[PDB]
């Protein structure tokens, strides 16, 4: 017979729950040890950046209750990119919290079809669809409870990959936080791709965009990409990379993969 | 860690491809031996009723080419209900054929979210989302190439279950074909369901709707439900049931399941 | 040349703003003197039923601020039907309040295309489109802050017309409020309508549905339909009709219009 | 009372119908004398670029019948930008022809909400919503009947403005046709726009994109923008501009308007 449908299987560390880890005075890591889900607590509600796997919806709500954040207090959901391992529980979180989802046009159309018809993965990695409530332009500022979030487009991993920057505090003194999406091309066809003709040009420009980001502290959807280690608690950001080191190491791998593809 | 995502696993007979089996002068079974996918060839294009599993998209196009039906000749896609085992390849068939999808409001909203947030199954059975192009009302007539299709609402299995009736020919003499959805409640909570408060009333009315259907030849999305056997070719409709026998046997099981639920 | 686009022109009384008029301990009329927009204040947020004309968005927010209801306190928007003169400002209210919209499948698909492609009016009466966040079934209960709202389907005016019932208080003693949609067919083709084949059957059943509604106090999207007069303030409900009188008078006009159509 | 809704009123020349005007061996102007609606007839169907005002749906179908193009022969609809005066009848054309709509993400999200919530015009200019069937990336090639269409992004007038280029013939000898969107900012706030923070950068890059377009014959959604005159028939392209002259004149006006805004 025809082959059975195969689901998205990941490592066991991507689904290992952890307690809320503090990043700044209002920024908390409430995801897992290998998936970043940031919670920003303001005076007029909470903001969530990414969510992880689709089955992490209940775990995210439990950590929000640990921080004193009721479900109806979640006001907005921000996304780096609309893939299943980071925008999975968005649909379920909208129903159980009443929040809104902000994303650009490319992330909105990919989120609306549940990651299906992917430019590189096809229908292999899908998740429940969700609709975006506010369309975001490049450089637009989103304000929730006095905390301003600025969107920075960085197409490559997905056409709608977006980096979010905001200024928090660390016991009074300010700190610039940058949450940038992945800059990798896992198994992508880089040259002459019919679905993404200008893929190389968007990666090169995104490398420069990440370098110029105002950032004192960098975080990525996968903690290992920015040399974070959520398991060691207080010393999690000890070896974290800079925006230059994160972009320089990404461009060196992109050039090597682009060279091997030629051969 | 959290449990891995589990996909929809079915029997091997649901994915066993078969050659186009003739039902009438213009009606053909082009699905598998355990999944019904009807092809109606007209003078101004072709019409497809249901599709089966999501991975059956390539198999459906091959049988259409066997009948001399080009991809651009598929004009319309009709659906009984928007579940994965029967509306799976709808999204892929729209891209590769340029056809339109007609469905009622309940089937359109379930198809738009890929079967997720199901009233009884939740997110356990999902598929790539698709958007309906024409909304159909109860009793509305859809005409393609002189062949009139009449929609008959029969809510129960899904809130938007629809039966389609049309008149074909069998070597000149006419024949009334009825394609009715399933009348079963597999594992449903029948009494006091918060997601479907009037589930019992819709099943009772749907039982009467199927009995009154103008039908000389009955077909169901699952061939065993109407006692069809696609494997024996010409003698496939030898033991096929009537609309009364199909509805009477469905209501007897519904009453028994409703009685066991009380206990 | 071709004719210019003509907009939806209404009477001056439909756009005459008024102060919040109290209906019960938690129910307030915050629309205009000829358009009903109900505000239900609970302990965990506010609920809005209908909105009126699209340009009434600013007026609705001002009356909510008069009641001490911040924009972020609006939690849910309920709709009777998705026409421009009652679901107009829904799209703008979602952006400026962060609320969610609950509606059935028929109201959701009509709201998603902004009232265009109407079964009887075509594209003559349009408004900014909005997407529903929660799909509601017949008889489903929606709870906000301890106040339960029950949806009652009554198709006719639109295929997704819904009546909402809830129990409030009047200085301690309870009162059953029923917000039923219009039961009129203004200029509709009642017999043999291709877009709505079973229009007569849905009107007859909706007449009986309104009679059986649990109701001590009836309100309609147009106040004159239920003999309300918002201009006289405290004596607004003095001449209000019952559910029987409202349905009996509607069925008598429907039979007369159906008889004149035959001629 | 509140102000009445005001519709989109245009000049009488935008609604002045005209007969099919030939541009190349397969390219025809089937719109009006002041609105461009291009019809490309291939061996495997027809392609339509833009449509004009919403009320021009019937006029477009009549000219298609004059060219021997049946409604079911229209295979694809391409859009320059999703404004009412050029994407108006898209929703009605989809229902009456069965065609598909191809657009980028920005044009798809603006077309899905009927031009409402415009970045500069708000809800002042709306039209019936339509859904895109295929999402197009920058530089992607769309092939219909052996004629290849290449999309060139040129954001500015709208965030999803797209220029389409294709090679036709003029009695055997080939000719490169370029259909570029408007490069004007009518009444836009150019500096410090919250809804479009990087508006100036997108206009500057779009000016350079239009200059480098492979083009022997340039056409614009408004004929006067490229110095076309559909009224004089055969001598319509006598004074048509080049891509350089069209972009140079657009950048000179943009710099002047940007200078006056500073004052």
UniProtKB/TrEMBL annotation, chains A, B, C, D:
Domain of life: Bacteria
Residues at which Zn(2+) 3 binds: 85-86, 222
Chief localization: periplasm
Broadest EC class assigned to this enzyme: hydrolase
Residues holding Zn(2+) 1: 81, 83, 85, 157
UniProt cross-references to SUPFAM superfamilies, sorted A to Z: Metallo-hydrolase/oxidoreductase
Binding-site residues for Cu(2+) 2, renumbered to this chain: 85-86, 222
GO CC terms in record: periplasmic space
Catalytic reaction(s) noted: a beta-lactam + H2O = a substituted beta-amino acid
Gene3D superfamilies: Ribonuclease Z/Hydroxyacylglutathione hydrolase-like
Record-level GO BP terms: antibiotic catabolic process; response to antibiotic
Alphabetical list of InterPro entries matching this protein: Beta-lactamase_class-B_CS, Metallo-B-lactamas, NDM-1-like, RibonucZ/Hydroxyglut_hydro
Metallo-beta-lactamase domain segment(s): 34-222
Cellular compartment(s): Periplasm
Binding site for Zn(2+) 2: 85-86
GO molecular function annotation: beta-lactamase activity; zinc ion binding
Keyword Hydrolase attached: yes
Chain sites annotated for binding Cu(2+) 1: 81, 83, 157
UniProtKB keywords: Antibiotic resistance, Hydrolase, Metal-binding, Periplasm, Signal, Zinc
Family listed: Belongs to the metallo-beta-lactamase superfamily. Class-B beta-lactamase family.
PANTHER family recorded: METALLO-BETA-LACTAMASE DOMAIN-CONTAINING, METALLO-BETA-LACTAMASE DOMAIN-CONTAINING PROTEIN
Identification of the protein by name: beta-lactamase
Protein species of origin: Stenotrophomonas maltophilia (strain K279a)
């Amino acid at each position: 017979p025809l082959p059975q449908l195969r689901a998205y299987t990941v490592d066991a560390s991507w689904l290992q729950p952890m307690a809320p880890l503090q990043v700044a005075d209002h920024t908390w890591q409430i995801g897992t040890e290998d998936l970043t889900a940031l919670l920003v607590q303001t005076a007029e509600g909470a903001v969530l950046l990414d969510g992880g796997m689709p089955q992490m919806a209940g775990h995210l709500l439990d950590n929000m209750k640990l921080r004193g954040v009721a479900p109806q207090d979640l006001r907005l959901i921000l996304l780096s990119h609309a893939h299943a391992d980071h925008a999975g529980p968005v649909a379920e979180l909208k129903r159980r919290t009443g929040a809104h989802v902000a994303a650009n046009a490319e992330t909105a159309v990919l989120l609306a079809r549940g990651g299906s018809n992917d430019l590189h993965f096809g229908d292999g990695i899908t998740y429940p669809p969700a609709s975006a409530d506010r369309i975001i332009m490049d450089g637009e500022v989103v304000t929730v409870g006095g905390i301003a979030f600025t969107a920075h487009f960085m197409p490559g991993h997905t056409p709608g990959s977006t980096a979010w920057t905001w200024t928090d505090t660390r016991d009074g003194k300010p700190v610039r936080i940058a949450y940038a999406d992945s800059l990798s091309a896992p198994g992508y066809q880089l040259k002459g791709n019919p679905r993404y003709p200008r893929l190389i040009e968007d990666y090169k420009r995104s490398f420069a965009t990440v370098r110029a980001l105002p950032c004192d502290l960098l975080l990525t959807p996968h903690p290992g990409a920015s040399n974070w280690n959520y398991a060691v608690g207080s010393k999690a950001s000890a070896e974290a990379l800079t925006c230059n080191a994160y972009a320089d190491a990404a461009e060196k791998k992109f050039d090597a993969q682009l060279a091997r593809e030629t051969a």
